[PDB]
Amino acid sequence: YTRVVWCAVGPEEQKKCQQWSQQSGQNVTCATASTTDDCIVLVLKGEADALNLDGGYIYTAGKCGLVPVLAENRKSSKHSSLDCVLRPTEGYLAVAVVKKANEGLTWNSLKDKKSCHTAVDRTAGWNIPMGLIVNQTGSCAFDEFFSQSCAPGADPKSRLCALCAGDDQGLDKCVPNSKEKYYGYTGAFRCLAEDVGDVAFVKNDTVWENTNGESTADWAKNLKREDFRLLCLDGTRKPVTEAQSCHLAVAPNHAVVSRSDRAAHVEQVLLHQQALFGKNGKNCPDKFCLFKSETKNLLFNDNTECLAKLGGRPTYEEYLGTEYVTAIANLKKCSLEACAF
Ligand SMILES: *[C@@H]1O[C@H](CO)[C@@H](O[C@@H]2O[C@H](CO)[C@@H](O)[C@H](O)[C@H]2NC(C)=O)[C@H](O)[C@H]1NC(C)=O
Ligand SMILES: *[C@@H]1O[C@H](CO)[C@@H](O[C@@H]2O[C@H](CO)[C@@H](O)[C@H](O)[C@H]2NC(C)=O)[C@H](O)[C@H]1NC(C)=O
Ligand SMILES: *[C@@H]1O[C@H](CO)[C@@H](O)[C@H](O)[C@H]1NC(C)=O
Ligand SMILES: NC(=O)c1cccnc1
Numbered sequence: 001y002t003r004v005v006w007c008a009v010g011p012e013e014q015k016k017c018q019q020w021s022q023q024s025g026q027n028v029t030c031a032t033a034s035t036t037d038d039c040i041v042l043v044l045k046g047e048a049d050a051l052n053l054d055g056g057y058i059y060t061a062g063k064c065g066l067v068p069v070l071a072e073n074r075k076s077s078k079h080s081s082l083d084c085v086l087r088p089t090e091g092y093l094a095v096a097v098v099k100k101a102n103e104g105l106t107w108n109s110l111k112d113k114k115s116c117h118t119a120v121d122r123t124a125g126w127n128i129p130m131g132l133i134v135n136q137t138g139s140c141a142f143d144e145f146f147s148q149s150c151a152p153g154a155d156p157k158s159r160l161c162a163l164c165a166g167d168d169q170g171l172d173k174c175v176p177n178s179k180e181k182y183y184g185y186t187g188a189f190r191c192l193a194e195d196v197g198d199v200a201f202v203k204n205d206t207v208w209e210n211t212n213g214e215s216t217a218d219w220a221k222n223l224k225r226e227d228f229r230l231l232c233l234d235g236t237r238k239p240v241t242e243a244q245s246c247h248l249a250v251a252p253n254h255a256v257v258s259r260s261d262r263a264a265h266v267e268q269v270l271l272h273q274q275a276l277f278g279k280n281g282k283n284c285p286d287k288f289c290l291f292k293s294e295t296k297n298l299l300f301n302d303n304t305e306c307l308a309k310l311g312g313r314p315t316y317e318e319y320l321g322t323e324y325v326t327a328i329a330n331l332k333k334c335s336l337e338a339c340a341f
């Protein structure tokens, strides 16, 4: 049944997809939508086959019967012989970052400050930090905790979208796709780097990849690691070198999902496609690389080493872990079980 339709979210992923489609001789084609939720609906309709999702969206996707297929895998020193494709995944660290110069700003003096989020419903940018905040404050009124935010996905007219910028021209303010200047892990850290916000909720890989000459992008050009700090839950402030001990939680890797009746087929074309355009593919650097997009994390995060088999053909709760499934459940009570479409 060898022909896979990828769902791209927004015009930039649409363009990267169209490119990949060409280089594959149409073994993969593209469908496009404005939001991740819409791409999820397309897959359900059967109009698209798969897409890579942050854990927060896997949860939405799972209640509707979509299943995790292969997971993103970057690389950790001690997990060495084992192949990337068979190596277990580690999950990433969700952290809260602040400007060093913002002396005296801790996890406990966050109320009324200005925040930068990857996008509503996402693990590091939303579910983990707001989960703790509802928790800590005993209030479901998370829309009144920060004076202002850029939380792609919220009501364009609420304070939660006040700090968002939209595209080149001011259009699409607060859309949960890359047209929004402060969308995703990158847009969010940018929102803080330009001091639009006091804190950004991203993952720890983001600070390292957009500081000390790693980014090339004009806004990240002069960023230095020592000018940032991580906020720990114990009210303390640490250098970004100490994330192992100052994170809010460890998140499950983004993963490709698809309808169960389509999973095997999706899995097979991907392992092949990967063999050709992944980290060491026949054709990567020279013609095309699935995992690169010059600091934008288009379709896939730019630090993905390979997509890996899951082992224990896990359901989505098994993939997310009970720990995280319950964090999302408790937070979702504020805004009991069904495909939400
Ligand atoms: C926010 O507070 C809630 C309430 O204690 C935390 O909740 C529960 O999480 C623990 C540990 O994972 C579970 O054993 C309980 O079953 C959960 N309680 C309920 C009523 O569901 C919640 O996880 C905290 N937020 C974070 C980010 O950890
Ligand atoms: C925090 O995020 C950064 C960037 O994504 C990670 O940085 C690298 O660590 C890997 C191995 O862990 C090395 O191969 C790279 O050299 C590091 N990057 C840079 C630019 O120095 C880092 O692993 C993460 N740290 C934690 C605690 O999660
Ligand atoms: C497309 O898929 C077919 C079927 O597996 C494969 O034989 C062929 O090499 C692929 N072509 C390209 C250009 O990827
Ligand atoms: N998703 C799972 O079932 C699982 C099992 C063991 C380790 N990691 C993930």
Ligand SMILES: [Fe+3]
Pocket: 054, 055, 122, 123, 124, 251, 254
């Ligand atoms: Fe994420």
Ligand SMILES: [Zn+2]
Pocket: 247, 248, 249, 250
């Ligand atoms: Zn931990």
Ligand SMILES: [Zn+2]
Pocket: 312, 313, 314, 315, 318
């Ligand atoms: Zn299982």
